[PDB]
């Protein structure tokens, strides 16, 4: 019912929630455990 794109963008970003202090530590631990599987699984290759 609108045509201003900034209202569409802010309405789309409005659905998600802000993060607390420990939430960023949780997501950083997720990223490190995502890359650590690639690190410890490349050790069985000749490359």
């Amino acid at each position: 019912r609108t045509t201003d794109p900034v209202r569409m963008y802010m309405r789309e970003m409005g659905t998600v929630e802000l993060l607390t202090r420990e939430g960023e530590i949780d997501i950083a631990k997720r990223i490190e455990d995502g890359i650590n599987q690639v690190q410890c699984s490349v050790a069985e290759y000749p490359e």
Binding site: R1, T2, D4, R7, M8, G14
Partner: protein
């Protein structure tokens, strides 16, 4: 006759209608619905008959 075609019932359900008339396409909260009707008419900078 106006009080029957009126779809609202309460205060917090009537500011939402003014918000959806003036700012369509944005989902309203109460804290931003009160401030629109306050700063529309009853603010010392946004309204002036002078």
């Amino acid at each position: 006759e106006t009080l029957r075609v009126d779809p609202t019932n309460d205060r917090l359900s009537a500011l939402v209608e003014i918000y959806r008339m003036m700012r369509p396409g944005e989902p309203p909260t109460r804290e931003a619905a009160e401030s629109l009707f306050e700063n529309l008419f009853f603010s010392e900078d946004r309204y002036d008959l002078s």
